[PDB]
Assembly symmetry: C3
């Protein structure tokens, strides 16, 4: 645990399995302490900056609550202005921020941006999200998996990412398998697989640690034995709207529905999903896409799965805050 003090948190592969175990134990302690009304503040007098170049309105909440609970003050710097590196270089920005703040949370674009912030600020920099990795969500998922399979090592678990696994969360799961020996199934069309070189590197590491990484288009063999099925949205705003039709055509067979859950053969399989999810007609955008592409009842997951007892998405969402807090406490307090 002492190995975290004054260090950044830029991706999971910068840490050992034992360090990850200690971090998740801290998150679980902080969660229990707050639930029981006995949280001990370790960050009184610390000032934290949130550099959120990529942002939704709600994104800041888990980070602010984590800091506030621990006694720190927060300065939120959102995506309304220009990007970092537009008017001022990343190195210059890092040097200025590092004299003002005790810690910096980053959410944005290329991994090199957060590496430069970490190198030149002189204070812990925590990667919430980059193009390459989604460490904040990964930690939240890992804690949630432990809570719902108590007393199991990660190398005893099987996790499925269904749908479009070619993104920063797919990469973070590859890292998790590499480090912890997780049995990881990326169940996806071949065009939606993470890059082969990173897959090959993490697969060699995972093997050494008692795990395995499988990429397959076949849903029945892919999800068999799963303890958890994770998915996320199939289309994003920014990727051109005229590509949505072919992407949806490719991905709609990979919808997490009651059939896919039953194909695991595991009555205790649980469902995960980085929020927001398009699972019904109760959003303007979800209702439009359901009508335009024929997806009433839910897109990447059905309303039935999303609201089922197997769905643990709101525990997962809450656990973002507890694991963010563990990172801040472990790196800022001795």
């Amino acid at each position: 645990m002492s190995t975290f003090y004054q260090k950044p948190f830029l991706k999971l592969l910068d840490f050992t399995a034992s360090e990850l175990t200690a971090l998740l134990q801290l998150a679980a302690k902080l969660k229990a302490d707050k639930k029981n009304g006995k949280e001990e503040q370790k960050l009184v007098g610390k000032n934290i900056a949130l550099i959120f170049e990529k942002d939704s309105t709600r994104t800041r909440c888990s980070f602010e609550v984590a800091a506030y609970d621990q006694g720190a003050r927060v300065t939120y710097l959102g995506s309304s202005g220009s990007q970092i590196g537009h008017k001022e270089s990343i190195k210059d920005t890092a040097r200025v921020l590092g004299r003002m703040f005790d810690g910096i949370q980053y959410r944005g674009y290329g991994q090199e941006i957060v590496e430069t912030l970490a190198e030149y600020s002189g204070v812990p920099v925590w990667n919430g999200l980059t193009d390459e990795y989604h460490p904040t969500q990964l930690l939240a998922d890992l804690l949630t998996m432990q809570e719902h399979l108590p007393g199991k090592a990660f190398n005893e678990m099987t996790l499925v990412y269904a749908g479009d696994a070619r993104n920063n969360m797919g990469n973070s799961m590859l890292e998790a398998a590499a480090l912890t020996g997780l049995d990881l199934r990326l169940v996806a069309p071949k065009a939606c697989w993470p890059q082969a070189a990173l897959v090959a590197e993490c697969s060699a590491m995972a093997k050494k640690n008692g795990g395995a990484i499988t990429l397959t288009e076949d849903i029945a063999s892919g999800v068999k034995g799963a303890d958890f099925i994770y998915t996320d949205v199939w289309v994003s705003m920014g990727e051109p709207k005229e590509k949505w039709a072919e992407r949806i055509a490719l991905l709609r067979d990979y919808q997490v529905n009651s059939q896919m859950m039953a194909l695991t053969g595991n009555p205790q399989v649980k469902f995960l999903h980085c929020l927001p999810a398009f699972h019904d007609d109760e959003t303007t955008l979800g209702k439009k896409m359901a009508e335009e592409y024929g997806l009433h009842g839910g897109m990447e997951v059905t309303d039935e799965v999303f609201e089922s007892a197997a769905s643990i998405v709101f525990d997962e969402a809450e656990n973002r805050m507890h694991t963010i807090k563990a990172v801040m406490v472990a790196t800022l307090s001795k």
Copy 2:
């Protein structure tokens, strides 16, 4: 007072007259305590979310100061992003926020949004403003009226809303008359009256409580005997600009000016107005509208009334903060 603990505050009609009296007494105590330098913080360790879908830059101030004074921390989520229910359903948003925050203040659109937040968050949700009601402003006005008519019950007071009463504040005043027995005069062109069914319902209730609700186009009989004349702006950005000419033509006879104040026959009549007000040429928009529609000297209220000794608009504005604070304290602290 104990009846408020862990409850939402969604509209005045959810409360009894006695509960309202106790709430306003708490606001007056908190105001006195702060003025005398002896405020006791009841909200240390509480995290409050401000979900302000409809916002002006200044709107957050009264809510943040109220929370800060009481020791709470605040996360402001403004109207720059997408609306709630665009990308994530209201129910999903409520469930996530309710695990993070101890209380949620909402300012936005339909009343059903704030009802859903209240139902699914599991924490107190306070309605600052919806399409239907303006509870935060109503409480501020009621406290201000008590302060300027000490020792009078609301059923001993006469309040006039002059101008366009067809809006959320008109509805909140109908509720206030229904509940407290206020003598309420909506002095307005018939096209600018609140909906007849809500008027009829509140009129039956008001009668039972010793009050009365009058809707009239006649200014002389409408304002006679008034203790307070309230008004607000006649045109809003969003309503189409080409409708302004007919609206102003309809409403300009209802300007609160020295003549209307004298027609009350009450030398102690006071003037109220939810800020901002267009009362002179010292705003870019007010100066343009004054020139375009012939309203130099003030629109819905003249500069003379606005700056007169009868004007209590800045006491009213300050009392937003004290009454907001009373709602937060009454619902979050036992």
Copy 3:
């Protein structure tokens, strides 16, 4: 020091040389105390408003950290909404804010706006930046100059502003020379000189205080003997892009480079610059301007000077926070 209590800070000329000396001593004490882990909070329970009509995303950081360190709470009101005086008059806004907040920091447009805020709010108002002055940056520069020339009075120092001195910082330096007896050199094309009347007024004052103000196009005589060379960007977004070519043509001879530094004849000359600076190709805008106008290697300052041992820009940037804090402490705490 007692003369600051409950006063605004609108421009340097509102203060005496002795008051400025005491303010900078307070800033140096607060800086030392924080570095040594023994800061004593003087602003617990104070609520401060940041009215930043002109804003970059990073601008709020120094003000928030200063307030947070001292125990105050902050409400940031940014430039995303409409300007003050668009929908509500400055006087009305000042009266409302002054009942809510203990102090108000302003960054924006005309000096009359901040004067009106100060006059009608009833609480200390601090001018961070207006069209006419840049007091926050001036105080940071003065502290930085003292730190790098310990035991020297300002009337023993020579400061150069190279480049376009016709702006709010040039005006603030004229005031500093007027008040402290600084030897101030504005080394600039004649079209980029501050207004003659303000120059003549401050020159009369500076003479009385043992200083001098020189405006010259001649770089060799202008910078000779300098203790410090300050500069800032040559072109701003808002000024029309088609004027950039002639402005750059006029200003590029005034680039702070190794040659200009050597022309001082002073091996210990230091370099200052209100950040951000365009000193290399590591910003999108800087790289485009370097390519379009032939300025690879740096615009108003070369990368070599900017990264040299003589460059003290990051000490200067940090000292914004310590001097802001001194203003808040001196005016809010007895």
